């Protein structure tokens, strides 16, 4: 059973939909990633992170601040699992914290999405029904899921 | 050498000086009879900064006391250390201003100021090398805010290259004791920006807040506020009177804290401050001093410093301590708070170390930071001024002594322009 789960990932990471978020994540470098990077630059620990990477703290702050947690990802461990799954091949060099070199943060966001279908799964079901989710309906669905999860 | 003279005006300034000189005398071991009884050799090496020498070996402050009424100086003389002041320096009128700025700046203050300017000129011409002047006065009173500011212009006209300090108490809207405070505050701020090289605002509301929250004493009085202001005043010039690792006179602070000539309004704070019951719990370390130094409630002004970004900052450490720790802590306080520091000027914190601590304390810090958060005080002062002026309330008192509304309009416009151009740099980006 364990071998089968391991065999199961990596294909999802290579999908165009995930890469587009991460393709859009290139645009996050274009603006969202530049803002996150600018927040990572406010961390003095930046000397330990590559100039093109974001820290786990900045990625967790992004997930919290953009309501990815708790609305889309109900469990904060899933953010850590996403981050670790994206950065899995990076070795810790010279005791420096592992940054999002291009996408361990993008891989962590995929694990949050996939890890817990939750708020984002409800948004996907509503969108598949042809219901245009306005921000007030999204907030209400997120509040209802957060109440069911607490 | 490089000494300064003391000039104070008004009742508030006289009460501030009455404690400032007591603090200085206690620091230098001078008895209230003018006789030295100190313990350390360093207590006498640089005593020429504030004290003159007379026959008989006694010392006399080079202070000049002025007011439009004789009561306050007749009262300060009977207080402790009141005999040090030379009787010749006392100049006063027989009428008073009645908290009217026009009377203390146009009609009555103009005729009297010649006598006080005579003694001011006598004091400055004589001294070895002048460093500058320091002024204590209140913006909430008529005679003070008028005569002091006109004297500022008269002194600046004759000594354009010397440095000028002003410790100014501005009227807060929370604790208001005079109804005509906005008028003479707004009129005074207009003249103060044009001539003062440095200005340090102090608020009674912030002093009460500090006394109630940090010291936690039950019944604050003017003596405690004066003592805090006096300690803050003494902390600035400590390294000019004592040796240290990095001496830094007033001119060096002027160079490093004023980016543009019109931005010279600072707010200050003193650390450490602890209650009587908790003075044994705490341990004095550089991290403990620096965490209290940048605390928002520790500022001597009600202005909230996390509502804006610091243009620059300064710290004057006292006592014997390692410089490496000071520098690393200054770096740490600037890396963890990058959002509140302007980004187009890097390394905007100045530090200095003096090896002589205050009497009774092992370490002390004086903080002087130029921040954009000071705009809120001028905003509320101008708001009250324009609320009262639109109906021409109390205007006849001022207009009956040769003043007109045009000088009010120009003052309001210049003050609003100052408010705008002070925040212009807050939104500036590189």
């Amino acid at each position: 059973i364990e071998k089968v789960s391991n065999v199961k990932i990596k294909e999802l990471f290579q999908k165009d939909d995930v890469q587009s978020v991460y393709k859009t994540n290139e645009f996050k470098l274009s603006q969202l990633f530049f803002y996150l990077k600018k927040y990572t630059y406010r961390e003095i620990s930046r000397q330990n992170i590559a100039d093109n990477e974001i820290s786990y703290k900045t990625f967790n702050w992004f997930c919290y601040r953009f309501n990815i947690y708790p609305e889309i990802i109900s469990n904060p461990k899933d953010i850590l699992l996403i981050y670790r799954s994206v950065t899995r091949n990076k070795q810790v060099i010279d005791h420096k914290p592992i940054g999002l070199s291009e996408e361990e943060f993008k891989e962590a966001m995929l694990r949050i999405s996939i890890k817990g279908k939750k708020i984002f799964n409800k948004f996907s079901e509503q969108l598949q029904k042809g219901i245009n989710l306005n921000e007030s309906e999204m907030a209400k669905i997120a509040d209802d899921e957060n109440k069911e999860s607490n | 050498m490089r000494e300064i003279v003391h000039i104070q005006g008004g009742q508030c300034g006289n009460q501030i000086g009455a404690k400032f000189w007591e603090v200085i005398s206690d620091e230098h071991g001078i008895d209230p009879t003018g006789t030295y009884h100190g313990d350390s050799d360093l207590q006498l090496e640089r005593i020429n900064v504030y004290y003159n020498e007379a026959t008989g070996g006694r010392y006399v402050p080079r202070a000049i006391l002025m007011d439009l009424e004789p009561g306050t100086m007749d009262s300060v003389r009977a207080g402790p250390f009141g005999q040090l002041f030379r009787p010749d320096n006392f100049v006063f009128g027989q009428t008073g201003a009645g908290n009217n700025w026009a009377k203390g700046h146009y009609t009555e203050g103009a005729e009297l100021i010649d006598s006080v300017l005579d003694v001011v000129r006598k004091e400055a011409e004589g001294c070895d090398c002048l460093q500058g002047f320091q002024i204590t006065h209140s913006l909430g009173g008529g005679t003070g805010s008028g005569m002091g500011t006109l004297l500022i212009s008269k002194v600046r006209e004759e000594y354009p290259d010397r440095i000028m300090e002003t410790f100014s108490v501005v009227p807060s809207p929370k604790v208001s004791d005079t109804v005509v405070e906005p008028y003479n505050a707004t009129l005074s701020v207009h003249q103060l920006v044009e001539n003062a090289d440095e200005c340090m605002v102090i608020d009674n509301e912030a002093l009460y807040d500090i006394c109630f929250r940090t010291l936690k004493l039950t019944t604050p009085t003017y003596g405690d506020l004066n003592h805090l202001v006096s300690a803050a005043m003494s902390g600035v010039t400590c390294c000019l009177r004592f040796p240290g690792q990095l001496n830094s006179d007033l001119r060096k602070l002027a160079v490093n804290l004023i980016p543009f000539p019109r931005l010279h309004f600072f707010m200050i704070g003193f650390a450490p401050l602890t209650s009587r019951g908790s003075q044994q719990y705490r341990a004095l370390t550089v991290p403990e001093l620096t965490q209290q130094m940048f605390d928002a409630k520790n500022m001597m002004c009600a202005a909230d410093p996390r509502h804006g970004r610091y243009l620059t900052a300064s710290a004057l450490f006292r006592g014997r301590m390692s410089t490496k720790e000071v520098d690393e802590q200054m770096l740490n306080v600037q890396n963890k708070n990058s959002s509140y520091f302007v980004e187009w000027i890097p390394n905007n914190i100045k530090s200095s170390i003096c090896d002589i601590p205050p009497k009774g304390l092992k370490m002390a810090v004086t903080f002087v930071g130029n921040s954009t958060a000071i705009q809120e005080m001028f905003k509320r002062v101008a708001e009250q001024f324009t609320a009262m002026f639109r109906r021409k309330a109390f205007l006849h008192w001022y207009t009956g002594e040769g003043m007109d509304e045009m000088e009010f309009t120009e003052a309001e416009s210049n003050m609003n322009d100052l408010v705008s151009e002070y925040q212009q740099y807050q939104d500036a980006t590189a």
């Binding site: - | 050498m1 490089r2 090496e45 070895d128 090398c129 040796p243 240290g244 690792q245 990095l246 001496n247 006179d249 001119r251 060096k252 002027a254 160079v255 490093n256 804290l257 004023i258 980016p259 543009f260 000539p261 620059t312 301590m321 390692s322 410089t323 490496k324 720790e325 520098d327 690393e328 770096l331 187009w344 000027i345 890097p346 390394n347 905007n348 914190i349 100045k350 530090s351 500036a428 590189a430």
Partner: protein
């Protein structure tokens, strides 16, 4: 019949001069009173009977440090009228100490220099010490160098400047005067050695295991480096090196003379004797990037030439056997047009220990002076810091009002750009 004159200007310069002058007096057996209870002639002069007088002059506009010197234990050593002192400090303003108050003092200093030079018969050259990030230091150093370059001409001058750290800083305006002083000494000084404080702080923390260092600990290491550099002039050695034998060995081109130093071993008596301190291990430690005396990474650039001094009981064959090992390593690469880049000096006198200090007594030591292409990073970061504030013309009014022209800032920027282009042009292989 060989002499050298050391110039100390500014607070940092005087505080490192004190540090080197305890060490020299201790190394030549001279008591602090100046009395002995033929190698002294390099730094001292005989008065005919008894005391010795240092060939040094102390300069400062701010009198506190000189007054501290004239009352300490060394009051009897220095000649009373070579401790030139001013009255008014420049206050971190470069234009002040180059145009306003330094000009009236520079004539006395030049007269003292002439009076000291007429005594020497075999004058090797001048030494100068100045902290760059200050007004009087940088300004007076620039003016003195400019006067000496024309009064004497081809005599060699060596500058031990202390540049600001990459991120740690004490002032807020030091990039401006650092850039201007680099402009001034680029075309006027034969050798400049990098000495920023952060690297030496890290050295003390890692090796000396001191968690709270002060300036004295830094100055003692600098004094040891100076003593190691000048030992070859006053002690017998198997392979001597003179000061004039530098521009022929370390300076490939007239523009490129900024190099960074290192020292080894640095160790405390508590764990020094447990290990043998062989020549191979000390010469390996000297080349470690973490032991650079300036916060620059040599792995980021090529080497041009390495001049490295030994002292103690070292044997030349062991030195050659260690130079070969360094040439072997793949992490250290020299420039293409330099097949051999090492100049080696060997002296017999072991380094002397100062009582109550940090360093222990050892029989072998190594001091390296290495010229490398990686030094351009400090220029680039100082330039970036300068541009941020010069974009908005901040703090410029403090300089324009002291007689300096508006365009003087731009040409220093152009010279730094030229230097950075030159460093890139030299480092490319043919």
């Amino acid at each position: 019949m060989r002499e050298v004159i050391s110039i100390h200007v500014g607070q940092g310069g005087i505080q490192v001069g004190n540090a080197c002058w305890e060490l020299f007096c201790l190394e030549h057996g001279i008591q602090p009173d100046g009395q002995m209870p033929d190698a002294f002639n390099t730094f001292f002069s005989e008065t005919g009977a008894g005391k010795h007088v240092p060939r040094a002059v102390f300069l400062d506009l701010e009198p506190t440090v000189i007054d501290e010197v004239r009352t300490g234990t060394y009051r009897q050593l220095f000649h009373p009228e070579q401790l030139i002192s001013g009255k008014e400090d420049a206050a971190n303003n470069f234009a002040r100490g180059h145009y306003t108050i330094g000009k009236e003092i520079v004539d006395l200093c030049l007269d003292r220099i002439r009076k000291l030079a007429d005594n020497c018969t075999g004058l090797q050259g001048f030494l100068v010490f100045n902290s760059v990030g200050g007004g009087t230091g940088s300004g007076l150093g620039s003016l003195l160098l400019e006067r000496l370059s024309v009064d004497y001409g081809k005599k060699s001058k060596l500058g031990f400047t202390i540049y600001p750290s990459p991120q740690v800083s004490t002032a807020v305006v030091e990039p401006y005067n650092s850039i201007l002083s680099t402009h001034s000494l680029l075309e006027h000084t034969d050798v400049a050695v990098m000495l920023d404080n952060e690297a030496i702080y890290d050295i003390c923390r890692r090796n000396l295991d001191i968690e709270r260092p002060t300036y004295t600990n830094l100055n003692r290491l600098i004094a040891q480096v100076i003593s190691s550099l000048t030992a070859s002039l006053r002690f017998d050695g198997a392979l001597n090196v003179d000061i004039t034998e530098f521009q022929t060995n370390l300076v490939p081109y007239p523009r490129i003379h900024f190099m960074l130093s290192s020292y080894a071993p640095i160790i405390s008596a508590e764990k020094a004797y447990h290990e043998q301190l062989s020549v191979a291990e000390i010469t390996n430690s000297a080349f470690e990037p973490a032991n650079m005396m300036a916060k620059c990474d040599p792995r980021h650039g090529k080497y041009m030439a390495c001049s490295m001094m030994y002292r103690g009981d070292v044997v030349p064959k062991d030195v050659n056997a260690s130079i070969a090992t360094i040439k072997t390593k793949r992490t250290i690469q020299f420039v293409d047009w330099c097949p051999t880049g090492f100049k080696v000096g060997i002296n017999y006198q072991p380094p002397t220990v100062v009582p109550g200090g940090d360093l222990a007594k050892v029989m072998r030591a190594v001091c390296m002076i290495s010229n490398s292409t990686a030094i351009a990073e400090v220029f680039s970061r100082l330039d970036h810091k300068f541009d941020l504030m010069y974009a908005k013309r901040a703090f410029v009014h403090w300089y324009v009002g002291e007689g300096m022209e508006e365009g003087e800032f731009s040409e220093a920027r152009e010279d730094l750009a030229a230097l950075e282009k030159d460093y890139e042009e030299v480092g490319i292989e043919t």
